[PDB]
Coordinates of C-alpha atoms and ligand atoms in Angstrom, one line a residue:
Chain J
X7 CA 0.1 -0.4 -0.1
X8 CA 3.1 2.8 0.6
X9 CA 6.1 3.3 -0.6
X10 CA 9.2 4.9 1.0
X11 CA 10.2 8.3 -0.5
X12 CA 12.5 11.2 0.8
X13 CA 9.5 13.2 1.9
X14 CA 8.0 9.3 4.2
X15 CA 5.4 6.5 3.3
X16 CA 3.4 7.6 0.5
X17 CA 0.5 5.5 -0.2
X18 CA 1.8 3.7 -3.8
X19 CA -2.2 4.3 -5.5
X20 CA -0.7 7.6 -5.8
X21 CA 2.7 7.9 -7.5
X22 CA 0.9 8.0 -10.9
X23 CA 3.4 8.8 -14.1
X24 CA 6.4 8.0 -13.3
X25 CA 9.9 7.3 -14.5
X26 CA 11.2 4.5 -13.0
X27 CA 15.9 5.7 -13.9
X28 CA 16.7 8.7 -13.7
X29 CA 19.3 10.4 -11.4
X30 CA 19.7 14.0 -10.2
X31 CA 23.5 13.6 -8.5
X32 CA 25.9 11.3 -10.0
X33 CA 29.4 10.2 -10.1
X34 CA 31.6 7.1 -10.5
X35 CA 33.2 5.4 -7.7
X36 CA 37.2 7.9 -7.2
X37 CA 34.7 11.3 -7.6
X38 CA 35.5 12.0 -4.0
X39 CA 39.2 11.7 -4.5
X40 CA 39.1 14.5 -7.3
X41 CA 37.7 17.2 -4.5
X42 CA 40.0 19.4 -5.3
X43 CA 39.2 20.5 -8.2
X44 CA 35.5 19.0 -8.6
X45 CA 34.2 20.3 -5.9
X46 CA 29.8 20.2 -5.1
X47 CA 28.2 23.2 -6.3
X48 CA 25.4 22.6 -3.7
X49 CA 22.8 25.7 -4.7
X50 CA 24.1 25.8 -8.3
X51 CA 23.6 22.3 -8.6
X52 CA 19.9 22.6 -6.3
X53 CA 18.7 25.1 -8.9
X54 CA 19.6 22.0 -11.9
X55 CA 18.6 19.6 -10.2
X56 CA 14.2 21.6 -9.6
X57 CA 14.5 22.2 -13.1
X58 CA 14.8 18.5 -14.1
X59 CA 12.0 18.1 -11.9
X60 CA 10.4 21.1 -13.2
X61 CA 10.4 19.5 -16.6
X62 CA 9.3 16.3 -16.2
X63 CA 6.4 17.5 -14.6
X64 CA 5.1 19.3 -17.5
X65 CA 4.9 16.3 -18.9
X66 CA 2.2 15.0 -16.0
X67 CA 5.8 12.8 -14.3
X68 CA 4.7 12.3 -10.4
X69 CA 7.1 10.4 -9.1
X70 CA 10.7 9.4 -9.4
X71 CA 13.2 6.4 -8.7
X72 CA 16.3 8.0 -8.4
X73 CA 18.8 4.3 -7.9
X74 CA 22.5 6.8 -7.6
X75 CA 24.3 4.4 -5.6
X76 CA 25.4 5.0 -2.2
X77 CA 29.3 5.3 -3.5
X78 CA 28.3 7.6 -6.4
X79 CA 27.4 10.8 -4.4
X80 CA 23.6 9.6 -3.1
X81 CA 21.7 12.5 -1.1
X82 CA 18.4 11.7 0.3
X83 CA 18.8 15.1 2.0
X84 CA 20.2 17.1 -1.5
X85 CA 16.5 15.0 -2.9
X86 CA 14.5 15.8 0.0
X87 CA 15.0 18.7 -0.8
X88 CA 14.1 18.7 -4.3
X89 CA 11.0 17.0 -3.7
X90 CA 10.0 19.1 -1.0
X91 CA 10.7 22.2 -3.1
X92 CA 8.4 20.9 -6.7
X93 CA 6.3 18.2 -4.7
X94 CA 7.7 15.5 -7.4
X95 CA 7.9 12.0 -5.8
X96 CA 11.7 10.9 -5.0
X97 CA 12.4 7.2 -4.3
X98 CA 16.2 6.6 -3.9
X99 CA 18.8 3.4 -3.7
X100 CA 20.9 1.4 -0.9
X101 CA 23.3 -0.5 -3.1
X102 CA 27.3 0.2 -4.5
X103 CA 27.6 0.6 -8.2
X104 CA 29.2 -2.4 -9.8
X110 CA 36.1 -3.6 -3.0
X111 CA 38.5 -3.2 -1.0
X112 CA 36.2 -1.8 1.9
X113 CA 34.2 -5.1 1.2
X114 CA 37.2 -7.3 -0.2
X115 CA 38.3 -6.3 3.5
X116 CA 35.3 -7.6 5.3
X117 CA 35.1 -10.7 3.2
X118 CA 38.1 -11.4 4.9
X119 CA 36.5 -10.5 7.8
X120 CA 33.9 -13.2 7.6
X121 CA 31.3 -10.8 7.9
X122 CA 30.5 -9.0 4.3
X123 CA 27.6 -10.7 2.9
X124 CA 25.7 -10.1 6.5
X125 CA 26.7 -6.6 6.9
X126 CA 25.3 -5.9 3.2
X127 CA 22.5 -7.6 4.1
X128 CA 22.4 -5.4 7.3
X129 CA 23.1 -2.5 5.4
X130 CA 20.0 -2.6 2.9
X131 CA 17.6 -3.6 6.2
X132 CA 19.2 -0.3 8.3
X133 CA 18.4 1.6 4.9
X134 CA 15.3 0.0 4.1
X135 CA 13.4 0.3 7.8
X136 CA 15.3 2.7 9.7
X137 CA 16.8 5.3 7.5
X138 CA 20.2 6.8 6.5
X139 CA 22.5 7.5 8.0
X140 CA 20.6 10.6 9.8
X141 CA 18.3 11.7 7.0
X142 CA 15.6 9.6 8.5
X143 CA 15.2 8.8 4.9
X144 CA 14.5 5.0 3.9
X145 CA 14.7 4.0 0.1
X146 CA 12.5 2.5 -1.7
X147 CA 14.8 0.1 -3.2
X148 CA 17.9 -2.1 -3.3
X149 CA 20.3 -0.9 -6.4
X150 CA 22.2 -4.3 -7.9
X151 CA 24.7 -4.2 -10.3
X152 CA 26.6 -6.8 -12.5
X153 CA 30.1 -6.8 -15.7
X154 CA 30.3 -7.9 -18.1
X155 CA 29.0 -11.6 -19.5
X156 CA 29.5 -12.3 -15.7
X157 CA 27.9 -12.1 -12.2
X158 CA 31.3 -11.7 -9.8
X159 CA 31.4 -13.7 -6.5
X160 CA 31.4 -10.1 -5.1
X161 CA 28.1 -8.8 -7.2
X162 CA 26.6 -12.5 -6.3
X163 CA 27.2 -11.4 -2.3
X164 CA 24.7 -8.9 -3.0
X165 CA 22.8 -10.2 -5.1
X166 CA 22.3 -12.6 -2.9
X167 CA 22.0 -9.9 0.2
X168 CA 19.1 -8.4 -1.7
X169 CA 16.8 -11.4 -2.5
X170 CA 17.1 -12.0 1.4
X171 CA 16.1 -8.6 1.8
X172 CA 13.7 -8.7 -0.4
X173 CA 12.1 -11.1 1.6
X174 CA 11.3 -9.4 4.7
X175 CA 10.8 -6.1 3.5
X176 CA 9.6 -6.6 0.7
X177 CA 11.5 -3.9 -1.1
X178 CA 11.8 -3.7 -4.8
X179 CA 15.2 -5.0 -6.5
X180 CA 16.4 -3.1 -9.4
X181 CA 19.3 -3.8 -11.7
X182 CA 21.8 -2.9 -13.6
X183 CA 22.9 -5.0 -17.0
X184 CA 26.1 -4.2 -18.5
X185 CA 26.2 -3.7 -22.0
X186 CA 23.3 -6.0 -23.1
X187 CA 24.2 -9.1 -20.9
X188 CA 22.8 -11.4 -17.9
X189 CA 19.3 -10.3 -18.1
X190 CA 18.2 -13.8 -17.8
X191 CA 21.1 -14.5 -15.2
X192 CA 20.5 -12.2 -13.2
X193 CA 16.4 -12.8 -13.1
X194 CA 17.4 -16.6 -12.0
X195 CA 19.7 -16.4 -9.8
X196 CA 17.8 -13.7 -7.5
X197 CA 14.6 -16.4 -8.3
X198 CA 17.0 -18.9 -6.4
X199 CA 17.6 -16.7 -3.7
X200 CA 13.8 -16.5 -3.2
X201 CA 13.3 -13.0 -4.5
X202 CA 9.8 -11.9 -5.6
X203 CA 9.6 -11.6 -9.2
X204 CA 6.9 -9.4 -9.3
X205 CA 9.7 -6.8 -7.6
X206 CA 12.1 -7.1 -9.4
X207 CA 13.5 -4.7 -12.2
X208 CA 15.8 -5.7 -14.3
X209 CA 17.5 -2.5 -16.1
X210 CA 19.5 -1.9 -18.8
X211 CA 17.5 -4.3 -20.8
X212 CA 18.0 -1.9 -23.8
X213 CA 21.8 -2.7 -23.8
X214 CA 20.5 -5.9 -25.9
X215 CA 19.2 -5.9 -29.5
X216 CA 18.1 -10.2 -29.0
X217 CA 14.7 -9.9 -28.4
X218 CA 14.7 -13.3 -27.4
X219 CA 17.5 -12.4 -24.8
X220 CA 14.6 -10.2 -23.8
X221 CA 12.3 -12.7 -23.8
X222 CA 14.2 -15.5 -22.6
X223 CA 13.8 -12.6 -19.7
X224 CA 10.7 -12.2 -19.5
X225 CA 10.1 -15.2 -19.4
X226 CA 11.0 -15.3 -14.9
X227 CA 8.0 -12.4 -15.1
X228 CA 10.5 -10.4 -14.1
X229 CA 9.8 -6.2 -15.3
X230 CA 12.5 -5.1 -17.7
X231 CA 13.2 -1.8 -18.3
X232 CA 14.4 -0.1 -21.7
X233 CA 16.0 3.1 -19.2
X234 CA 18.8 4.9 -21.3
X235 CA 16.8 6.2 -24.3
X236 CA 18.8 9.2 -25.9
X237 CA 22.3 7.6 -24.8
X238 CA 24.3 6.1 -28.5
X239 CA 27.7 5.8 -29.1
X240 CA 28.8 5.1 -25.6
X241 CA 29.4 2.9 -23.7
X242 CA 28.7 0.3 -26.3
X243 CA 25.3 1.6 -26.7
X244 CA 23.0 0.5 -29.1
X245 CA 21.1 3.4 -30.8
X246 CA 17.2 4.9 -29.8
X247 CA 16.2 3.1 -33.4
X248 CA 17.0 0.1 -32.5
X249 CA 15.7 0.6 -29.2
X250 CA 12.4 1.2 -30.3
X251 CA 12.6 -1.1 -33.0
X252 CA 13.8 -4.2 -29.8
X253 CA 10.1 -2.7 -27.6
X254 CA 8.0 -2.7 -30.5
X255 CA 8.6 -6.5 -31.6
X256 CA 8.0 -7.1 -27.6
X257 CA 5.2 -4.8 -27.1
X258 CA 3.4 -6.5 -30.8
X259 CA 4.1 -9.6 -28.7
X260 CA 2.0 -8.5 -25.9
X261 CA 4.7 -7.8 -22.7
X262 CA 3.5 -4.2 -21.6
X263 CA 2.0 -5.8 -18.1
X264 CA 6.5 -5.9 -17.8
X265 CA 8.1 -3.0 -19.6
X266 CA 9.3 0.1 -18.1
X267 CA 11.0 2.7 -19.9
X268 CA 13.5 5.6 -18.7
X269 CA 16.5 7.8 -19.9
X270 CA 19.2 6.8 -16.8
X271 CA 20.5 10.9 -17.1
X272 CA 22.7 12.4 -15.1
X273 CA 21.4 15.6 -14.2
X274 CA 24.8 16.9 -12.0
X275 CA 27.9 15.4 -12.4
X276 CA 29.0 14.8 -9.3
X277 CA 33.5 15.4 -9.3
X278 CA 35.5 17.3 -12.2
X279 CA 33.4 19.3 -14.8
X280 CA 34.2 17.6 -17.9
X281 CA 33.3 18.3 -21.9
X282 CA 32.1 15.7 -24.1
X283 CA 34.1 15.1 -27.4
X284 CA 31.9 16.5 -30.3
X285 CA 31.7 12.8 -32.1
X286 CA 30.2 11.4 -29.2
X287 CA 28.7 15.4 -28.1
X288 CA 26.4 15.0 -30.9
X289 CA 24.9 11.5 -30.4
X290 CA 24.3 12.1 -27.0
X291 CA 22.2 15.5 -27.9
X292 CA 18.6 14.3 -26.8
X293 CA 19.9 12.0 -23.6
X294 CA 17.8 14.5 -21.3
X295 CA 14.1 13.7 -19.2
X296 CA 11.3 14.9 -21.9
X297 CA 13.2 12.7 -24.5
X298 CA 10.4 10.1 -24.0
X299 CA 8.1 12.9 -23.6
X300 CA 8.7 14.5 -27.4
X301 CA 10.4 11.9 -29.4
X302 CA 10.0 8.5 -28.2
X303 CA 6.3 7.9 -27.3
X304 CA 5.2 10.4 -30.5
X305 CA 7.2 7.8 -32.3
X306 CA 5.6 5.2 -30.4
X307 CA 1.9 6.3 -31.8
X308 CA 2.6 6.5 -34.7
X309 CA 3.5 2.2 -34.8
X310 CA 0.3 2.0 -33.0
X311 CA 0.7 1.9 -29.5
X312 CA -2.2 2.8 -27.4
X313 CA -2.4 5.3 -25.0
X314 CA -4.3 2.0 -22.2
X315 CA -0.7 -0.1 -23.2
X316 CA 1.3 3.4 -22.6
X317 CA -0.5 4.0 -18.9
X318 CA 0.5 0.2 -18.4
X319 CA 3.6 0.9 -18.4
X320 CA 3.4 4.5 -16.8
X321 CA 1.4 3.9 -14.2
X322 CA 0.0 1.1 -13.7
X323 CA 3.4 -1.2 -13.6
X324 CA 5.2 1.4 -11.6
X325 CA 1.5 1.0 -9.3
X326 CA 1.6 -3.1 -9.4
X327 CA 5.9 -3.1 -9.0
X328 CA 5.1 -1.1 -4.8
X329 CA 2.2 -2.8 -4.2
Chain W
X7 CA 64.4 24.9 2.5
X8 CA 60.9 24.3 3.4
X9 CA 58.1 21.4 3.2
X10 CA 54.6 22.3 3.3
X11 CA 52.6 20.7 6.3
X12 CA 49.0 21.1 6.8
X13 CA 49.8 24.2 9.3
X14 CA 51.7 25.6 6.4
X15 CA 55.4 25.6 5.4
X16 CA 58.0 24.5 7.9
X17 CA 61.4 24.9 7.7
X18 CA 62.7 21.4 6.6
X19 CA 65.9 21.6 9.0
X20 CA 63.1 21.5 12.3
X21 CA 61.5 18.6 11.4
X22 CA 63.3 16.4 13.1
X23 CA 62.2 12.8 14.5
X24 CA 59.9 11.7 12.0
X25 CA 57.8 8.8 11.4
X26 CA 57.7 8.3 6.9
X27 CA 54.3 6.2 7.3
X28 CA 51.7 6.8 9.2
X29 CA 47.8 7.0 9.3
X30 CA 45.6 9.6 11.7
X31 CA 42.4 8.2 10.1
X32 CA 42.4 5.7 6.7
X33 CA 39.3 4.1 5.0
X34 CA 39.4 1.5 1.6
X35 CA 37.9 3.4 -0.6
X36 CA 33.9 2.3 -0.6
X37 CA 34.1 2.8 3.1
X38 CA 31.6 5.7 2.2
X39 CA 29.1 3.6 0.7
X40 CA 28.9 2.4 4.3
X41 CA 27.9 5.7 5.7
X42 CA 25.2 4.2 7.5
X43 CA 26.1 1.7 9.7
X44 CA 29.9 3.3 9.3
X45 CA 29.5 7.3 10.8
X46 CA 31.9 9.4 11.2
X47 CA 33.1 10.5 14.6
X48 CA 34.4 13.1 14.9
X49 CA 35.7 14.2 18.1
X50 CA 35.9 10.5 19.1
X51 CA 37.9 10.3 16.3
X52 CA 40.2 13.5 17.2
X53 CA 40.8 12.3 21.2
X54 CA 42.4 9.2 19.2
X55 CA 44.5 10.9 17.0
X56 CA 45.6 13.4 20.1
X57 CA 46.7 10.8 21.7
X58 CA 48.6 8.8 18.7
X59 CA 49.7 12.4 18.4
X60 CA 51.4 12.9 21.9
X61 CA 51.9 9.1 22.3
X62 CA 54.7 10.3 19.5
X63 CA 55.5 13.6 21.0
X64 CA 56.8 10.8 24.4
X65 CA 59.2 8.8 21.8
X66 CA 60.5 12.6 20.6
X67 CA 59.1 12.3 17.1
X68 CA 58.8 15.9 15.8
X69 CA 57.1 15.1 12.7
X70 CA 54.6 12.3 10.5
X71 CA 54.2 11.7 7.5
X72 CA 50.3 10.9 7.1
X73 CA 50.3 9.2 3.1
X74 CA 46.2 8.7 3.7
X75 CA 45.2 8.9 -0.5
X76 CA 42.5 11.4 -1.6
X77 CA 39.9 8.7 -1.5
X78 CA 40.5 6.9 1.5
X79 CA 40.0 9.6 4.1
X80 CA 42.6 12.1 3.8
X81 CA 41.1 14.6 5.9
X82 CA 43.3 17.8 6.0
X83 CA 41.8 20.0 8.6
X84 CA 41.1 17.0 11.0
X85 CA 44.9 17.1 10.4
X86 CA 44.8 20.3 11.2
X87 CA 43.3 20.2 14.2
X88 CA 45.6 17.8 16.0
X89 CA 48.8 19.7 14.8
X90 CA 47.3 22.6 16.1
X91 CA 46.3 20.6 19.2
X92 CA 49.7 19.0 19.5
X93 CA 52.7 20.7 18.0
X94 CA 53.3 17.3 15.7
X95 CA 53.9 18.5 12.3
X96 CA 52.1 17.0 10.2
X97 CA 52.4 16.6 5.8
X98 CA 49.7 15.1 4.2
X99 CA 49.7 14.0 0.5
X100 CA 48.3 13.6 -3.0
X101 CA 47.9 10.7 -4.3
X102 CA 45.5 7.8 -4.9
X103 CA 45.0 3.8 -3.4
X104 CA 45.8 1.0 -6.0
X110 CA 38.7 3.6 -12.0
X111 CA 36.0 4.1 -13.1
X112 CA 35.6 7.6 -12.4
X113 CA 39.6 8.0 -13.9
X114 CA 38.6 4.9 -16.5
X115 CA 36.0 7.2 -17.5
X116 CA 38.5 10.2 -17.7
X117 CA 40.7 7.5 -19.2
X118 CA 37.7 7.5 -22.4
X119 CA 37.6 11.6 -22.8
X120 CA 41.6 11.5 -23.3
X121 CA 42.3 13.9 -20.1
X122 CA 42.8 11.2 -17.3
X123 CA 46.6 11.1 -16.6
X124 CA 47.2 15.3 -17.8
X125 CA 43.5 16.1 -15.9
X126 CA 45.6 14.1 -12.0
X127 CA 49.0 16.3 -13.2
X128 CA 47.0 18.8 -13.2
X129 CA 45.6 17.8 -9.3
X130 CA 48.7 16.8 -7.8
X131 CA 49.8 20.6 -9.0
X132 CA 46.8 22.2 -7.6
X133 CA 47.5 20.3 -3.7
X134 CA 51.0 20.3 -3.6
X135 CA 50.9 23.9 -4.8
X136 CA 47.7 25.7 -4.3
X137 CA 46.2 24.6 -1.7
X138 CA 43.4 21.0 -1.0
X139 CA 39.8 21.5 -1.1
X140 CA 39.4 25.4 0.4
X141 CA 41.7 23.6 3.7
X142 CA 44.4 26.2 2.3
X143 CA 46.8 22.9 3.3
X144 CA 49.6 22.1 0.5
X145 CA 50.4 18.4 0.5
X146 CA 54.0 17.9 0.8
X147 CA 55.3 13.9 -0.8
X148 CA 52.4 12.8 -3.4
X149 CA 51.7 9.5 -2.9
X150 CA 51.4 6.6 -5.5
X151 CA 50.6 2.7 -5.7
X152 CA 51.1 -0.3 -7.3
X153 CA 49.5 -3.5 -7.9
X154 CA 51.3 -6.6 -6.6
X155 CA 53.5 -8.2 -9.4
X156 CA 52.3 -5.9 -11.6
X157 CA 52.2 -2.1 -12.5
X158 CA 49.1 -1.5 -14.2
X159 CA 49.1 0.9 -17.4
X160 CA 45.9 2.6 -14.8
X161 CA 49.0 3.2 -12.3
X162 CA 52.0 4.1 -15.0
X163 CA 49.3 7.0 -15.6
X164 CA 50.3 8.3 -11.9
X165 CA 53.8 7.5 -12.1
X166 CA 53.6 9.4 -15.2
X167 CA 51.8 12.5 -14.2
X168 CA 53.8 11.8 -10.4
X169 CA 57.5 12.4 -12.5
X170 CA 56.2 15.9 -14.2
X171 CA 55.0 17.3 -10.8
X172 CA 58.1 16.0 -8.8
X173 CA 60.2 17.7 -11.7
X174 CA 57.4 21.1 -11.2
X175 CA 57.8 21.3 -7.6
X176 CA 60.8 19.3 -6.9
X177 CA 58.0 17.5 -4.4
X178 CA 58.6 14.1 -2.3
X179 CA 57.0 10.9 -3.5
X180 CA 55.9 8.2 -1.6
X181 CA 54.6 4.8 -2.7
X182 CA 53.0 1.5 -1.6
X183 CA 54.3 -1.9 -3.6
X184 CA 51.7 -4.4 -2.8
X185 CA 53.0 -7.9 -1.3
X186 CA 56.5 -7.4 -1.6
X187 CA 57.4 -6.9 -5.2
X188 CA 58.0 -4.0 -8.2
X189 CA 60.5 -1.6 -5.8
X190 CA 63.0 -2.0 -8.6
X191 CA 60.1 -1.3 -11.2
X192 CA 59.1 1.4 -9.3
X193 CA 62.2 3.2 -8.8
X194 CA 63.2 2.5 -13.1
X195 CA 59.9 3.7 -14.5
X196 CA 59.5 7.0 -12.0
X197 CA 63.3 7.8 -12.7
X198 CA 62.7 7.3 -17.0
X199 CA 60.4 10.0 -16.4
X200 CA 62.8 12.3 -14.7
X201 CA 61.9 11.9 -11.5
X202 CA 64.8 12.4 -8.6
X203 CA 65.3 9.2 -6.9
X204 CA 66.9 11.4 -3.8
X205 CA 63.2 12.9 -3.8
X206 CA 61.8 9.5 -3.7
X207 CA 60.3 6.7 -0.6
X208 CA 60.1 3.3 -2.0
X209 CA 57.4 1.3 0.1
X210 CA 56.4 -1.8 2.4
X211 CA 59.9 -3.0 0.8
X212 CA 59.4 -4.6 4.5
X213 CA 57.6 -6.6 2.9
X214 CA 59.7 -8.8 0.5
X215 CA 62.7 -10.2 2.4
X216 CA 65.3 -11.5 0.0
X217 CA 68.0 -8.4 0.7
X218 CA 68.4 -8.9 -3.5
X219 CA 66.0 -7.3 -3.7
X220 CA 66.3 -5.1 -1.8
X221 CA 69.7 -4.3 -2.9
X222 CA 68.5 -3.8 -6.5
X223 CA 65.8 -1.3 -5.8
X224 CA 68.4 0.7 -3.6
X225 CA 71.1 0.4 -6.7
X226 CA 68.5 3.3 -8.1
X227 CA 69.3 6.0 -4.9
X228 CA 66.0 6.2 -4.4
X229 CA 65.3 5.6 0.4
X230 CA 63.7 2.0 1.0
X231 CA 61.1 2.5 3.6
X232 CA 60.3 -0.4 6.4
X233 CA 57.6 0.7 7.1
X234 CA 55.0 -2.6 8.1
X235 CA 56.7 -2.6 11.6
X236 CA 53.9 -4.4 13.6
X237 CA 51.7 -6.1 10.3
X238 CA 52.8 -9.8 11.2
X239 CA 50.2 -12.7 9.8
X240 CA 48.0 -10.0 7.1
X241 CA 48.5 -9.4 4.1
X242 CA 50.9 -11.3 3.2
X243 CA 53.3 -10.3 5.5
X244 CA 57.0 -11.2 7.2
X245 CA 56.9 -11.2 10.7
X246 CA 59.2 -8.5 12.6
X247 CA 61.6 -11.3 13.2
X248 CA 62.3 -11.2 9.9
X249 CA 61.9 -7.5 8.8
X250 CA 65.3 -6.6 11.4
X251 CA 66.6 -9.4 9.8
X252 CA 66.5 -7.8 6.6
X253 CA 66.9 -4.7 7.9
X254 CA 69.8 -5.3 9.4
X255 CA 71.9 -7.3 6.5
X256 CA 71.2 -3.8 5.0
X257 CA 72.1 -1.7 7.3
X258 CA 75.5 -4.0 7.9
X259 CA 75.6 -3.6 4.6
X260 CA 76.0 0.4 5.3
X261 CA 72.5 1.4 3.6
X262 CA 71.7 3.8 6.0
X263 CA 71.5 6.8 4.5
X264 CA 68.5 5.2 2.8
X265 CA 66.9 3.2 4.9
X266 CA 63.1 5.0 7.2
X267 CA 61.2 3.2 9.4
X268 CA 57.5 3.2 10.9
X269 CA 54.2 1.5 11.4
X270 CA 51.8 2.2 9.3
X271 CA 49.3 2.5 12.3
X272 CA 46.0 3.0 11.5
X273 CA 44.8 5.0 14.3
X274 CA 40.6 5.3 13.3
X275 CA 39.1 3.7 10.7
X276 CA 36.8 5.0 8.4
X277 CA 33.8 3.1 8.0
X278 CA 31.5 0.5 9.8
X279 CA 33.5 -0.4 12.7
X280 CA 35.1 -3.8 13.1
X281 CA 37.2 -6.7 15.4
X282 CA 40.1 -8.7 14.0
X283 CA 39.4 -12.8 15.0
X284 CA 41.7 -13.8 17.6
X285 CA 45.0 -15.7 14.7
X286 CA 44.8 -12.1 13.4
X287 CA 44.3 -10.5 16.8
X288 CA 46.8 -11.8 17.8
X289 CA 49.1 -11.5 15.2
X290 CA 48.7 -7.6 15.1
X291 CA 49.7 -6.8 18.3
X292 CA 52.3 -4.5 18.1
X293 CA 50.9 -2.3 16.0
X294 CA 51.0 0.2 17.4
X295 CA 52.6 3.8 16.7
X296 CA 55.2 3.3 20.4
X297 CA 56.6 -0.5 18.1
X298 CA 59.8 0.8 17.0
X299 CA 60.7 2.8 20.2
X300 CA 60.3 0.4 22.9
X301 CA 61.3 -3.0 21.1
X302 CA 62.2 -2.6 17.3
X303 CA 65.3 -0.2 18.0
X304 CA 66.0 -2.1 21.3
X305 CA 66.4 -5.5 19.7
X306 CA 68.5 -3.2 17.1
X307 CA 70.9 -1.4 19.3
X308 CA 71.8 -5.4 20.8
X309 CA 72.4 -6.2 17.0
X310 CA 74.8 -3.1 17.7
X311 CA 73.3 -1.0 15.7
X312 CA 74.9 2.5 16.2
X313 CA 72.6 5.3 17.4
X314 CA 74.3 8.1 14.7
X315 CA 72.8 5.2 12.5
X316 CA 69.7 5.8 13.9
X317 CA 69.5 9.8 13.9
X318 CA 70.1 8.9 10.0
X319 CA 66.9 7.1 9.7
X320 CA 65.2 9.0 11.9
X321 CA 67.0 13.0 11.7
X322 CA 68.9 13.4 8.7
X323 CA 67.1 11.2 5.8
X324 CA 63.9 12.4 6.5
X325 CA 66.1 16.3 6.4
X326 CA 67.2 15.0 2.9
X327 CA 64.4 13.7 1.4
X328 CA 63.0 16.8 2.0
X329 CA 65.5 19.5 0.8
Ligands
LIG401 FE1 21.5 4.6 -13.6
LIG402 FE1 49.9 4.1 4.3
LIG403 O1 23.8 4.0 -14.8
LIG404 O1 49.1 1.2 3.9
LIG405 ZN1 23.2 1.0 -14.7
LIG406 ZN1 50.4 2.0 1.3

C-alpha cells in the first residue's frame, strides 16, 4: 500500500506517472578523491535538480525512482530538498555501483551479512541521519558475468527483499546477464513481481529479452537517449526492439526511462564532438517529446503506455 | 629549505625526529557507501588522533608523514586540528590508493593531465578550501605489476615532481615492484633523492632490496608490527633483512615506520583471534619500545638510527 520516498511513506496508488530510472546527482566512484578540482556546488546543483524535476512535472510525471548507488554520490537530504520544492515523489536506493572495503570484510567473514545489514537499516530504519528510507535495492553486474563479489550483493538483496518486500532494480552491463540475474535472484527466493532488470535495451536481440521476461520480472529500457557510448545501441534499435515486445503483448512487464545524470559530481568535463552530437537527446523530456510520439506512429495505444508509466510502477511497488 | 605541512610551510631543518608513514584516519575506498552503519565520529576520532600524536611526541617524534590517499578519507582540516593541538608537524599527501572515475576520463582523453593537474593544485595551491598543501605525492602499484592505470599516476607524479621538487612516496603490494617503480619513475625524470619506495619490508630477499637501492632511492620498512595478514612477513624477518642492509652500509637510504591506522573509517569491526594476537604490536610506539631496542642488541649505533630518523627525512625534504 505504501512506498518510502525521500519525503516519507506515500500510498502506492498516488505515485501516478513514474520514471523508473533517473539520477539527480551522480559521480563515478573515485570522484571523491578529486575534490580540489571537483568541488560540489550545492546551490547551483539544487537549481539544476529542481529544473529537471519541473521538466518531468510538465509531462505529467508525478514520481521518479533515483537509483544512485551509495558510492556514487547518493544524497537523500539533497533529494528531499528537490521533492520539498517541487512536490515530485522521489524514491532513492540502497546499493553499490558495479572492493576493497568489502574485499576486506570478506576477509573478516562478515561481508554478505554486513551488506544485508546495510540494506535492512537503509530500507527500514533510515539512511545515515536523514530519516529517509530507500524504497529500492540497487544491484549491478559486470559484462558477461555476475562476479562472486556481485553475487554477495545479489544474495544479500534477495534476503532483504523477503524480509521487507522492497523492490530490486538492477544494472546490466552492455546488454548481458539479464536472464542470469533474474534466475539467480529467484533461486534465492526473490519475488519476480518485485524485480526490474535494468538496461535491457542494451541488447538488441528480442530472444534475449523474452528469455528474461519468461521469469516474470519487469525489464527496463531505461537508457533512451544514450547513443554512441558505453557500447550502447541507437534509439532506433531500442524502439525496434521495444516494438517487437509490445506487439507480442509484453506491456505489463516493461518500463521506460533515460538514465539521465542531471548533475555530474567530480571534475567538470565536456564531451568530444563525435560523442557530443550523438548524446544530444539524452535528457528527461526525450521519452515524451520524441519516443512516445514515434511509438504512436507505430500504433501503440494509450492504454498500453499508461500500463508502462502508471500501471506497472503501481503494480511494482504494491 | 621548506616543506608544506598541515600548518603551513616549515623549515626542513626543524622537522627533527620523523615517522615517514602513519595514518591518523584511513578507510578502504568504498567505506563512503557504508555511511549508515559507518558514521564518522569526529570528536572521538580527534581524541584518538591526539593521543596517537602525543605518544609519538613521547619518543621525541617531532614530524609525521601521513600519506592517506585522497580516496581513503584524507582529511587535511582534521589533521590540522591534530597539529594545532599537539604541535606535531604533519605532512599530508596527494594521490589515490592502488577506475571508473578516472577510467571515464581515460575515455575523454584527459586522465593523465587531470591527475597531473590535481597533483599541481594540491601541491602548490591547496587541498579543497583547507588552504593546506600536500608535501608528498603518494603512489601505489599492484601485486607483481604496475598497471597501465597506475603508470598514469606514476607519469603524472614524475612530471609534478620536476615542477615542484615534491617528494614521492610509494606503496608496493606484497613485496613486489620495488625496482620497477624506481626504474619507471627515473625514466620519466623523477629525482631518486626525492623518492621513497614503501612497504619494502614486504620482501625478505636482500637482493631485491639492493636491486632497489641501486637506484639511489630511499626504501621504507614501514610496516613494523603488521604480521599474519596481507601476506606480510614477521617483524623478526623484517629485522633480519634490515640488519643485512645496515651492516652493508645502507643507512643513508632507509627509513622506518608502522603504517598504523589510528582511526578506521567505515563500519567498526574486530579482528578474529588468530589475526588479532599477530597484530598486537601494531601501534605507533613499537619501533621505539621493541624494534630500536633489539637493533641495539644487534649493535646498531645511534649515529645510524639518527641518520634514519632525522638525517634521512631532512635530506629527503631538502
Ligand atoms: Fe543509472
Ligand atoms: Fe599506508
Ligand atoms: O547508470
Ligand atoms: O598502507
Ligand atoms: Zn546503471
Ligand atoms: Zn601503503
